[PDB]
Amino acid sequence: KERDMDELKKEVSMDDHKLSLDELHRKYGTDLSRGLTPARAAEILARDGPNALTPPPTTPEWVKFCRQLFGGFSMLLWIGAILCFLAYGIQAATEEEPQNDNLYLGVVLSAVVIITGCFSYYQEAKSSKIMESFKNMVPQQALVIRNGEKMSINAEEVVVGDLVEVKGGDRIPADLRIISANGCKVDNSSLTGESEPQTRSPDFTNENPLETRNIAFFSTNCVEGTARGIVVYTGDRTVMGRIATLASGLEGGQTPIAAEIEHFIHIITGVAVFLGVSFFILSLILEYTWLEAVIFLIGIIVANVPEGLLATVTVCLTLTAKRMARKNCLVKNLEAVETLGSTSTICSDKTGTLTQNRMTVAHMWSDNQIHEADTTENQSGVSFDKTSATWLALSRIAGLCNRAVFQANQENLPILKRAVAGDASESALLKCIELCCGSVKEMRERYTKIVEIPFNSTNKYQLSIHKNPNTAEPRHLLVMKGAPERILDRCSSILIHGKEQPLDEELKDAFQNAYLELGGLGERVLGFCHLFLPDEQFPEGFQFDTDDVNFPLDNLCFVGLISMIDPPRAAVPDAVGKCRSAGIKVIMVTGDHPITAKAIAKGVGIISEGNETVEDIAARLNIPVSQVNPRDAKACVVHGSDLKDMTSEQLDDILKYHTEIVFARTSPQQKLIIVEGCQRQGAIVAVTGDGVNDSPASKKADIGVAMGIAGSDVSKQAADMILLDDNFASIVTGVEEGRLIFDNLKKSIAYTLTSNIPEITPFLIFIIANIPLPLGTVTILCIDLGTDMVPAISLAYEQAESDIMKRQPRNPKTDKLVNEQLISMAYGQIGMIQALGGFFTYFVILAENGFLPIHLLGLRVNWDDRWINDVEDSYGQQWTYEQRKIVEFTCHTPFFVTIVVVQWADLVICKTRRNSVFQQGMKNKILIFGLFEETALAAFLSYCPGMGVALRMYPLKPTWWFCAFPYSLLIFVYDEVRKLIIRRRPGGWVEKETYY
């Protein structure tokens, strides 16, 4: 019945906040000024549960180990091992002196799966381990009023329906219902995604419990001021709690890489059972009994399963994940490293992910000129002209008349990332003056503050009078700031390059259009002004007691405006440009106000310049919006207020006809609906978020990306990839590496899949032509799990053949990892030449030892017999059992060496899929070592003392080392001219048939 629970969680929350204080207190039975008695609080504490989210569902380590021992690839090797023991059972109990080949192979396959499980498990567990070192859960106590007394208790010890007081800086414990506020501004950034610090007013404002101001929220911090409130929701019943529980209860889906692995297995086992069944029927048609034919069936099918490809693919993914971890881009999932490359639509979060989520000084107005300040997090932008006197006056008005100062440990931290006490606006101004106008430390005390006038509830203004330390004038310096309309109403003089001028409308209207320029840009603007009081009328001893008119409200000297907003992160615009360059559709999904979301989208690249919305065209023609055609609007903004009353088909149409989309004022549940809508198109979706609202979106998306520091812990756990450095450019690195490793996997797979033809053809013609076995089991293991291991891994180190960030994202229904072209090359052409070369070495050895190839036909009937010790060759010589058997094993060993020689050229041609080996170049040092190690190991397996006794691999007469040479050169030349024709003829045949 959990379906209904998850459904009740996908619905947007409701509340009873809109209630009179008497109605609220009667519903909760709580005193508004004294809270409640401690006994009642303890009774509720032991009634419904402590105020804390239920811990995540613990995942035992043996469970995820067993998880790594299963899957799809390991499952194929498991059925292979089981088929080996089945064939062994059919061989042990039915025939005399049964061979232990199948048993050896079965336990080997089991060991392959187990070892791969241990390695992959250690990697995923290592990621989870370093992730556990990031839980810096510091206990936080709340201020609760109970029985009429102020008590500071643990957050979990807080209950429902009791008065709670919060001070500027304290984090809101539970979900409160504000009853009495005083300049209280809370930070709803991590929950609803509202950028600027939304104030909290006790009066009911909006029907939406999120946009309203009489509700404090879980995981939100009180920015400034103080407030009181009755606890309404506690623990998991909270807003962010109901969101977190939803994130834990959503499905992860199937990664694209895993789906490609499954499709690959479909083709592998398809041809495996086809060959096994057709050859089983053929063997029964010949002479072999059902007893032997069954072994032939299981043998041909099992032999067609790449035993070593599991470890090679796992190591490949692990290597790319290693590179991800080097750039502080951790991946909790070993296959999630690839999902970025296949992604075709990225749903980003504005506040926190795209933006820095911090008020920063944007632009300044000086001498009727707009000056853009540097808004980069690392300070790597253009610096404004900081030399004029107007800048000095403006900077003094901002640095002096502002209730903001640094804190205790703020000394070694940078100027921006450090902590500041006060309003977010005042903090931005303080950071700007401390970064561009020297230091505000001595600049503040240089002007002794006499009398201050803080901000006002109505007709907001902040002024103060300061002394003057300049050695040229003893007059008093009065400074004031506020909303541009208030300053325009209380000013007459205007500052320009040092001197003053009247309020002439020629430059005053020039100030008004600049005000609308910065305001329309989605920023918050503040006007700054100052004036010199006449020391003749206000002497150095006349204390301007704060009661009456001691300062001229009007006749002040306006210096300029100072705008501010949360700027996007440093490499965010460039990264978005790269994603759109790669063909990835960027869709901003945020619950912030549209007035800012549209501007940020224009500033990052989600809304291109020149593209208009339906409302933009309606405004450009001075006509109602119901007239213009939405098809004439490339981009569109979707208000969350309107998204609620929408169907699936409507959202589908929004995505299909609008290329640049910005979802604003969207609830976390609506973020989930948006991601599901993008997934209905059949595209790969990546969601990059930070707040708790991005938790249900990061969990359902094909790949979730969380911020390593600015991201909430819930969404950070529900994500599949973490950016420890918060560098959004890692998204670009990710899509690049994902496409790269995808192609490298294709190459590596084609390599291991090429060796299957010469591995199985000996046993096939052993049944057809009735000739001695050309290649044994152990020798095949020396190729699949021995030599070719390093070449396959080295194939992961291959670089880009062309610009991968220039091509469009891969089509999930078309560009598969293992297409029919790959099989047409490995199983069809290259592996065929390798098999012919192996048989060549076979006949070379047997003919040189006295068994001409023509004479080998029908010889296995007596060749494998252990007692016919007088088998006649072509020269009349009689060979005993062990003599000809020694020849057979010393015939399996060079066949294996032949596999290595042909794999030389096969590796070189698989290294490049389109470019000539001369174009790409043998610069892969791991590949060079892959050839040296492969060759040296192959020689060691033949010439080491005791190999014919342990592995039955006898030494090779040196001439054998040159039997396969022409076949290898042939493979290299054929594939080289193939890629040459694909280069010169990019049209049809060579590309659509062989290019994989």
Place this chain on the structure above:
Amino acid sequence: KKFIWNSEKKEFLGRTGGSWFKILLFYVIFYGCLAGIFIGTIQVMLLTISEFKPTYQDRVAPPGLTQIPQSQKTEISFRPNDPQSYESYVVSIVRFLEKYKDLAQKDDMIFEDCGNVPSELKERGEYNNERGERKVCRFRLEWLGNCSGLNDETYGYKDGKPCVIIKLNRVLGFKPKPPKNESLETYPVMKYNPYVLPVHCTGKRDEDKEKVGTMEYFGLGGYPGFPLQYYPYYGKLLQPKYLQPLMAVQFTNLTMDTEIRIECKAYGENIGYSEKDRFQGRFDVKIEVKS
């Protein structure tokens, strides 16, 4: 998604007809060239070997020692009464000695009467084809006394006290070298040490050596071995219908209804042994005449 069989826009099993023809034609030409290349290289390989001698002969360094009853496990278990119990043995003995009858060796142009006494080796020039088809020394069944007879189409062999002849593995250019007169304890044998390769049978342990009472050997002129006048071998091409020497061994005093192991070890300097191949040089048999 697995009904891509056909469509009204021409696709079969996944692709169109013209595409099926293009791919099939390509694969036929490609595989045809691959086959021609493999055939040409295998032809060069055939050109690197001669018709009168194998290039490598070291894998047959120690010659083997086989017997006439090619038993399933080198075991001779039968009943002295039931004629069908030992039919599988007698059939193989008659088929083996079918090429040694006096009528089979009748042409004087390919057969040469070696002699009634084992003599020195007979080298018929070099192994080239400059000389004609070499002659093969005759070997009549009369040499294997008590194990040849003058029986009819069916060689009435020994029911009690069976016969087991031994044969030396035919090797090209192999010249057997019997041990020097300084015989290092070689189990009583005749003084004809210079022109015959000795072969002596015995038990395997203190039990088998006791159960096997008396053994009687038969050979050319009565010597337990192979005469050097029949070596070396010049290949099947130059010496067809060649008859390698034979030597019979009869176990007279056996313990009926008891499986006993016999090891017939051939001695000589050019005769090697192997702990892995119980047939290289030596030879084993498990006789059990259960009545």
Place this chain on the structure above:
Amino acid sequence: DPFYYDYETVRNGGLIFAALAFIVGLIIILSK
């Protein structure tokens, strides 16, 4: 006799090569 092959010489040489080629590969993946 032609029935003897110096397998120890070829074996020793094969191991010398299997050692040299491997140490050379190690030098290859260590560009210093």
